[PDB]
Design a protein that fits this description.
The complex is a heterodimer of chains A (337) and B (20). Chain A contains eleven helices and ten strands. By secondary structure, chain A is an alpha+beta fold. Chain B is α+β, with helices and mostly antiparallel strands and 20 residues long. Helix content of chain B is 30%, strand content 10%. Classes of the chains: A alpha+beta (337), B alpha+beta (20). Bound molecules: the ligand O=S(=O)(NCCNCCOCc1ccc(Cl)cc1)c1cccc2cnccc12. Ligand I5S binds next to strand 1, strand 2 and strand 3 of chain A.
């Protein structure tokens, strides 16, 4: 059953959490091919591991830039959590290491691209299509939350589509192991729960709100709360008002009013019955939760495959040298990485 | 339409994470 599965998943996770893997490869073991994505303190590159011929997505973080952005603890969280978790819809961390200049997290390469790109191009997903993705997130959060993890950045940009059409969640940069409340203002404007915006202490219920935003966005093709500037978005989110498209089913709108619930005593996922209030909802009546977990449901969409190291599903970015200083930067800050 | 307003907005591309 669910409880028994989660019990053993916690045993598995706790062992790795308390004794993290460290220094399991070296930069010289990989050939760098192409940038897949770029960030404030790093980038993700497609690489080939020479010893296996396997392609991987290598996230390279500049330690100096991490420190300047005050993301030291968040980055330590990211790697410590990722090396410890294990779940079908989570991107796998294969190796990690560091050098004088950078941190490196080598993850599984998912050539299908971000959901974001397929969603924008297609316009919107059908309710069944959206439901299929949403199911995988429900299970993923059920797993993460059971380990006392909050994810804190759900969005189509962080959901990769694999060769079977299933989701791989990446971007654990704000993920945190926390029992009880936390306070950091983080996330993405469109997906922030009202309590994050209003500087209250919050808990895993913010991920359930973010699920409501994702389902809305997937099914509508645009988010429930949008504007040109973040401040305007935050005003809409705290106003207590949401409008649904004409084409949204009655069930869908009812699921969404219970997820996008400003009142915590009323938000689905947070209540006495926890995730089951979501799983047993009418919108999910057709969903076979075990068959989703087992990946025996046929996906509504399978990305075009043009080879194991093809990048056609990703945009192009300006390539930039990977520089490794002859002097160690930020040794003490990242000692445990 | 709402779709049109979104498409004409400045936030239809990839959205950056924020923090304090
Ligand atoms: O970065 S990815 O290309 N796609 C996820 C994008 N996340 C949303 C915004 O990312 C911008 C960004 C990119 C890199 C860094 Cl270090 C900061 C911000 C990626 C990351 C992790 C594993 C991957 C596996 N396969 C393909 C792409 C992968």
């Amino acid at each position: 059953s669910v409880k028994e599965f989660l019990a053993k998943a916690k045993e598995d996770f706790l062992k790795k959490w308390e004794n993290p893997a460290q220094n399991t490869a070296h930069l010289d073991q990989f050939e760098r091919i192409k940038t897949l994505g770029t960030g404030s303190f790093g980038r993700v590159m497609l690489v080939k591991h020479m010893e296996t011929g396997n392609h991987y997505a290598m996230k390279i973080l500049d330690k100096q830039k991490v420190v300047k952005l005050k993301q030291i603890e968040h980055t330590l969280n990211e790697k410590r959590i990722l090396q410890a978790v294990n779940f079908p819809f989570l991107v796998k961390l294969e190796f990690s290491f560091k050098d004088n200049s950078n941190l490196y997290m080598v993850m599984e390469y998912v050539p299908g691209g971000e959901m974001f790109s397929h969603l924008r191009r297609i316009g919107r997903f059908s309710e069944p299509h959206a439901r299929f993705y949403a199911a995988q997130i429900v299970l993923t959060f059920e797993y993460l939350h059971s380990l006392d993890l909050i994810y804190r950045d759900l969005k189509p940009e962080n959901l990769l589509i694999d060769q079977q059409g299933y989701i791989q969640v990446t971007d654990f940069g704000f993920a945190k192991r926390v029992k009880g409340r936390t306070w950091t203002l983080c996330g993405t404007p469109e997906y922030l729960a009202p309590e994050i915006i209003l500087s209250k202490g919050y808990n895993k219920a913010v991920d359930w709100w973010a699920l409501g935003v994702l389902i809305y966005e997937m099914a509508a093709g645009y988010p429930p709360f949008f504007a040109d500037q973040p401040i305007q978005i935050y005003e809409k989110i705290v106003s207590g008002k949401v409008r649904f498209p004409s084409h949204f089913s009655s069930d869908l709108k009812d699921l969404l009013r219970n997820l996008l619930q400003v009142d915590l005593t009323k938000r689905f996922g947070n209540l006495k019955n926890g995730v089951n209030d979501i799983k047993n909802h009418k919108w999910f009546a057709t969903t076979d939760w075990i068959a989703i977990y087992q990946r025996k449901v046929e996906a509504p969409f399978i990305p075009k495959f043009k080879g194991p190291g093809d990048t056609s599903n990703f945009d192009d970015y300006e390539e930039e040298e990977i520089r490794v200083s002859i002097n160690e930067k930020c040794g003490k800050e990242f000692s445990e990485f | 339409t709402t779709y049109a307003d979104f498409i004409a907005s400045g936030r239809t591309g990839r959205r950056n994470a924020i923090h304090d």
